[PDB]
Design a protein around this ligand. Sequence first.
Ligand SMILES: [Mn+2]
Length: 309
Amino acid sequence: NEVLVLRGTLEGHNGWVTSLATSAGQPNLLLSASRDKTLISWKLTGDDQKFGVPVRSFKGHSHIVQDCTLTADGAYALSASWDKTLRLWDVATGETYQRFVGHKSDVMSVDIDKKASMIISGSRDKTIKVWTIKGQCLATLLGHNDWVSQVRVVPNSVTIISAGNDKMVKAWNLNQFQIEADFIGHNSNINTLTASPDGTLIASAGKDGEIMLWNLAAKKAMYTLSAQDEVFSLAFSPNRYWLAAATATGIKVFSLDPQYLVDDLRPEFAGYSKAAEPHAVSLAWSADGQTLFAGYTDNVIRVWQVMTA
Ligand SMILES: [Mn+2]
């Protein structure tokens, strides 16, 4: 008796909302990144026709901000930018504490370990970099033969996973700075990947809309879910066996146990033309899993909540 219901919007960005992040420490805080070169922290009220408001603007990047995340406590933000750098921000003030310089091209992805002791990034320079929180590059991981689109830390000795336009998904052992597993099977550019909260599964997808699920430990492919259209973002529910996928035609929410389509979220748009309908390119679940945030190509964040029918 549970459905996803459109609750409201968060307006304030002036470019595609490319990335979203929530935090367990601050369940009322949302972080967003945009092609408008900025990030925005939001205060969530969840009230009427204004689910929340912008509290801070994070300005400093000279190009598109592609990815962002918050530390566990929500005190700090990380951003990856096409300007070839990452920045660590003080969420309270909106200031940049540290710059991360080293990539030779667009930085497409950023993530951080649970201890918030080291930072990982992916770039169109084909490399993955490991940094200290003080902005010092420690090492560069080589193996991808094309752009790296996304890098993520696997929840659990740190293990990360990456995907790129070489159709490869890779797991790396940071204790060795070496490849742990090659996941072959994608036939198209991979836009996004993510690890299940228990760190046992990998989900990855891109252009052809094929969402491949991998058994990390066994280093094997399990099955593929057809989303039909290009997938831009994937996000496992923190508390449900649900996998949300932002696609060119809507947000498909898959139940994995048992297997069925929870929903295909498709908002009604203005009167845009069909040809020009905006779509979601970013996703984030709230810590409690009762809220799903999605950033769109019309600069708007849309908010769904799990309610009783
Ligand atoms: Mn993370």
